[PDB]
């Protein structure tokens, strides 16, 4: 029959995968997260009450670990884009620095794959930015043996966020339609007595410059608050109010995260393959 989903999340960040699966009502049986950022782990630990098994560095996951922790029904992950983006001048490409971490996903993906005779359902997805060289986008497609689909979060959220999505999830190419409760304009994500200048926000990153003064309060311009950044990305309010993180720390975690309504769109077809509440 249908049984809960066992998920392996590499480069888990602030546990967006576990968040979306529970928001969909999917019964999460096991969620193994490979994650090294101390503040990021504190978020997924506090906001999900220890339901996430953290295993720290992805390069320490042995073949025996995938067998013991397995079997896995869903393998998601997004390698860091610091050495893969056209923005940073000091790139290290796909093969040096943190760019080489993509192959760790490719490595553990084939370890988690079901054998040929095992026809059990198995899904996976890899995410990375679009601002990568054609030579690195081609090579990622050559290793994952499929082609990515581009889904911009502007269609379903209040910010630009064009990302590539490799994977075998059901209906990844389907048209993206915005849900009812999606905050599609910046004014929807703001707090009280604060006025939004623009309808959408330029792509938000880890740095403060994500215009630079897009809100008016008491007839004076002011930046976005952390609570407003969380609403832009679709996370719950105060999702990053953890571990005494200031404005700069919380924007770092949010700047590298996934757009929650986008991942909800991608993970939605999983409801018909596993148990739900």
């Amino acid at each position: 029959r249908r049984r809960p989903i066992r998920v392996l999340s590499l480069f888990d960040g602030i546990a967006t995968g576990y968040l979306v699966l529970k928001e969909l009502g999917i019964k999460v049986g096991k969620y193994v997260a490979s994650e090294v950022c101390e503040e990021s782990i504190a978020v997924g630990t506090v906001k999900h009450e220890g339901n996430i098994k953290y295993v720290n560095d992805v390069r320490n996951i042995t073949k025996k670990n995938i067998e013991e922790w397995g079997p896995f029904d869903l393998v998601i992950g997004g390698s860091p884009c610091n050495d893969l983006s056209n923005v940073n001048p000091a790139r290290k490409g796909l093969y040096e620095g943190t760019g080489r971490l993509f192959f760790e996903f490719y490595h553990l993906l084939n370890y988690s794959r079901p054998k040929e005779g095992d026809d059990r359902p198995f899904f996976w997805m890899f995410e990375n930015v679009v601002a990568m060289k054609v030579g690195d986008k081609r090579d990622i497609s050559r290793f994952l043996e499929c082609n990515p689909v581009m889904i911009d979060a502007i269609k379903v959220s209040a910010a630009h966020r064009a990302r590539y999505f490799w994977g075998n999830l059901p209906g990844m190419n389907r048209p993206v339609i915005a849900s009812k409760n999606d905050k599609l304009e910046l004014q929807d994500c703001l707090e009280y007595n604060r006025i939004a200048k623009l309808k959408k926000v330029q792509t938000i990153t880890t740095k403060s410059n994500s215009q630079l003064f897009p809100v008016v309060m008491n007839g004076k311009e002011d930046v976005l608050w952390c609570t407003e950044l969380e609403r832009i990305f679709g996370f719950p309010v105060h999702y990053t109010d953890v571990s005494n993180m200031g404005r700069g720390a919380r924007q770092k975690l949010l700047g590298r995260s996934w757009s929650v309504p986008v991942i909800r769109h991608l993970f939605a077809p999983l409801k018909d393959y596993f148990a739900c509440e």
Binding site: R59, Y95, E96, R100, F103, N110, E116, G117, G135, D139
Partner: protein, 179 residues
């Protein structure tokens, strides 16, 4: 280990030589056939656009060989590029789980992999490299410190070794002899 086969059952190996061709090398021991113009060795150097179906139609294969470029020479691609591409093409050439036929693979580096790259190499190929005074990762049943190795690497980099033949000896116990 794989179990040995009677001599009358053994057949010529068909090998996949990546990056560095060993056709002339394999003739010296006789795993390859002198004269066979449709050679059993398939040699490719640029594999960036190689798909799984390409290897399958080029297959089957019994030995998969991959090697980094010789010392000095050029950094056409990063040294990690050859290991990742070797690992990707190797999974294409492996026999299916419903076939216990003999299958071997070898990857050798001529002191071109850095300190961090060795850890990646050992993790992907699932074994620590053994030192032969080159380093060899392989499932063949066949099988000095770092400072001297590093300083020697610095001297040659400032300014095509094929000693690996001795590692191919136990492949004679599964395949033909001068054939």
């Amino acid at each position: 280990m794989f179990e040995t086969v009677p001599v009358w059952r053994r057949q010529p190996v068909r090998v996949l030589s990546l990056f560095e061709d060993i056709k002339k090398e394999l003739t010296s021991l006789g795993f390859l056939e002198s004269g066979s113009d449709p050679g059993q060795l398939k040699h490719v150097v640029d594999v960036t656009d190689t798909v799984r179906k390409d290897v399958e139609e080029w297959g089957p294969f019994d030995l998969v060989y991959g090697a980094t470029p010789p010392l000095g020479h050029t950094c056409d691609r990063p040294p990690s590029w050859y290991l990742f591409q070797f690992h990707r093409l190797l999974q294409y050439a492996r026999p299916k789980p419903g076939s216990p036929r003999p299958f071997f693979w070898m990857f050798v580096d001529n002191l071109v992999l850095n300190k961090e790259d060795l850890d990646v190499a050992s993790r992907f190929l699932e074994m620590e490299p053994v030192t032969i005074p080159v380093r060899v990762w392989s499932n063949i049943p066949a099988i000095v410190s770092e400072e001297e190795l590093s300083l020697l690497a610095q001297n040659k980099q400032s300014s095509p070794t094929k000693l690996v033949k001795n590692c191919f000896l136990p492949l004679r116990e599964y395949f033909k002899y001068f054939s």
